[PDB]
């Protein structure tokens, strides 16, 4: 039911290098649809889903103008954290940001997000009331206090409930059908020798979208579920995903086992076994 827009931004210190690398990447429903990168020859926000190709040159310039601003924001915060943490210059440091809004089932704002991370650790987050902050540690206090005193939260609150909400609607209108799309898994089972009378039957799911899936091995009243070997879901690199489930098995008694595949795409669940 829900839907969301989110922006992921990173800034990385570069030793001496008067400027740090800055990256921003936007997601609608976990799909990447815009990206801005400091290191580009001519850096600007750049479409990364088909449906962003409509937005005229007015939009890309404004969104680019914004990144220019964020760059400085991060160049400075990055420098302020050095001090909070007693870190010197000539080091590599990372600042990351996650921000955006969630729409509920009945197309109203369900909650807002603004999280920060320093060196890969939670640093500071706006709470759900979008007025008050959670700071991760002592050092985060120095920022919590400063932000409380500036009432910085009011500004994010406005974005989260205003602009964020309205643009998500806008993109969801331009990319509705594209986002709902399914690619159904294509399955098959392989047979590999293992040792004295054991065998490996692995069950492949290939070519599917989105990543979320479920693979199950059964004898009958499907038992074991301790010994099943699993791989994390992996991107084929073409837009599709992959995944596999294996079990170790007595020889001859080969066909009492049955892999089962489950995915939004499927007209019906997949059912298969060796051969």
């Amino acid at each position: 039911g829900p839907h969301s827009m989110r922006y992921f931004e990173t800034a990385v210190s570069r030793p001496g290098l008067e400027e740090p690398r800055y990256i921003s990447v936007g997601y609608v429903d976990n799909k990447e649809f815009v990206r801005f990168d400091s290191d580009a020859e001519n850096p600007r926000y750049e479409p990364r889903a088909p449906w962003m190709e409509q937005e005229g040159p007015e939009y890309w310039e404004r969104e680019t103008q914004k990144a220019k601003g964020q760059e400085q924001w991060f160049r400075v915060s990055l420098r302020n954290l050095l001090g909070y943490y007693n870190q010197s210059a000539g080091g590599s440091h990372t600042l990351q940001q996650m921000s955006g809004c969630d729409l509920g089932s009945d197309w109203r704002l369900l909650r807002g997000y603004l999280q920060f991370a320093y060196e890969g650790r939670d640093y500071i987050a706006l709470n759900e009331d979008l007025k008050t902050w959670t700071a991760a540690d002592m050092a985060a206090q120095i920022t919590r206090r400063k932000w409380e005193q500036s009432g910085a939260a009011e500004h994010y609150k406005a974005y989260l409930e205003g602009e964020c909400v309205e643009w998500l609607h806008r993109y969801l209108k331009n990319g509705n059908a594209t986002l709902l799309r399914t690619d159904s898994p294509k399955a098959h089972v392989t047979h590999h020798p293992r040792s004295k009378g054991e065998v490996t039957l692995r069950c492949w799911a290939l070519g599917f979208y989105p990543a979320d899936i479920t693979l199950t091995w059964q004898l009958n009243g499907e038992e074991l579920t301790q010994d099943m070997e699993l791989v994390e879901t992996r991107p084929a690199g073409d837009g599709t995903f992959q995944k596999w489930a294996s079990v170790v098995v007595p020889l001859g008694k080969e066909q009492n086992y049955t892999c089962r595949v489950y995915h939004e795409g499927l007209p019906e669940p997949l059912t298969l076994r060796w051969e």
């Binding site: 990447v25 290939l206 992996r234």
Partner: protein
């Protein structure tokens, strides 16, 4: 501050000896984002290895997909070698066509 790269090495399509294919090295759960990923054909670095743009996940950790065109055979071996600040020595993962 530092997290250890997970590595997966696997073909884009199920391999057939002789049939061109894409081989993937997929690296996840790392921080900091600086990383060097090599891919090897029999202990030789492969040049023209493509990298994706970097992303991070909701746990702030980064992931990236490096890949290259390859043509499987009986005898050749492929591997992915990753060098990362969070690891004293570069980690090498072999490709296994069964996995």
């Amino acid at each position: 501050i530092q997290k250890t790269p997970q590595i997966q090495v696997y073909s884009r399509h199920p391999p057939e000896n002789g049939k061109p294919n894409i081989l993937n090295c997929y690296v996840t759960q790392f921080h900091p984002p600086h990383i060097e990923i090599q891919m090897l054909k029999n202990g030789k670095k492969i040049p023209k290895v493509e990298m994706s743009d970097m992303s991070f996940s909701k746990d702030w950790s980064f992931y990236i997909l490096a890949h290259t065109e390859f043509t499987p055979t009986e005898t050749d071996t492929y591997a992915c070698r990753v060098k990362h600040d969070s690891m004293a020595e570069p980690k090498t993962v072999y490709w296994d066509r069964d996995m």
